């Protein structure tokens, strides 16, 4: 089993299935200690899942529009 119980990152899991249209709020936490951890709270599901940072829409939106 891949057991990585060593904390240098909050989001160990990432969902790439996140659609910006269904994202109520997201935030990319750029940890120098880890990498990009992003969170998506669904408008409909109301639940939050860590978003995969390599999603093209994520970086083009949160990183290019919000962050710039």
Swiss-Prot record:
**Impact of altering residue 1 to R?**
Abolished CXCR4 activation ability, but only slightly impaired binding to the receptor
Q: What is the effect of changing residue 12 to Q?
A: Slightly impaired chemotactic activity and enhanced inhibition by heparin. Greatly impaired chemotactic activity
Q: What is the effect of changing residue 41 to A?
A: No effect on CXCR4 activation
Q: What is the effect of changing residue 27 to Q?
A: Slightly impaired CXCR4 activation and clear resistance to inhibition by heparin
Mutagenesis or variant effect for residue 15 to A = No effect on anti-HIV-1 and chemotactic activities
Query: What, per the annotation, is the impact of changing residue 12 to A?
Result: Significantly decreased anti-HIV-1 and chemotactic activities
Give the consequence of mutating residue 27 to E.
Impaired CXCR4 activation. Loss of integrin activation
The highest taxon in the source lineage is Eukaryota
Q: Where is this site: Important for integrin interaction and activation?
A: 24, 27, 43
Q: Where is this region: Receptor and heparin binding?
A: 8-12
The UniProt-reported impact of residue 47 to Q is: Slightly impaired CXCR4 activation and clear resistance to inhibition by heparin
Q: What residues bind heparin, as annotated?
A: 20-30, 41, 48, 64
Outcome when changing residue 14 to A: No effect on anti-HIV-1 and chemotactic activities. Slightly impaired chemotactic activity and no effect on inhibition by heparin
> Mutating residue 60 to A: what's the consequence?
No effect on CXCR4 activation
What does changing residue 24 to E do?
Loss of integrin activation
**Name of protein:** SDF-1-alpha(3-67)
- Recorded source organism is Homo sapiens (Human)
Name of the gene this protein is made from: CXCL12
Instruction: Report which part of the complete sequence is shown.
Output: 22 to 89 of 93
């Amino acid at each position: 089993k891949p057991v990585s119980l060593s904390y240098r990152c909050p989001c160990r899991f990432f969902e790439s299935h996140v659609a910006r249209a269904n994202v109520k709020r997201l935030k990319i936490l750029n940890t120098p200690n880890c990498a990009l951890q992003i969170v998506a709270r669904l408008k409909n599901n109301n639940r939050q899942v860590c978003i995969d940072p390599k999603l093209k829409w994520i970086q083009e939106y949160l990183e290019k529009a919000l962050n710039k």
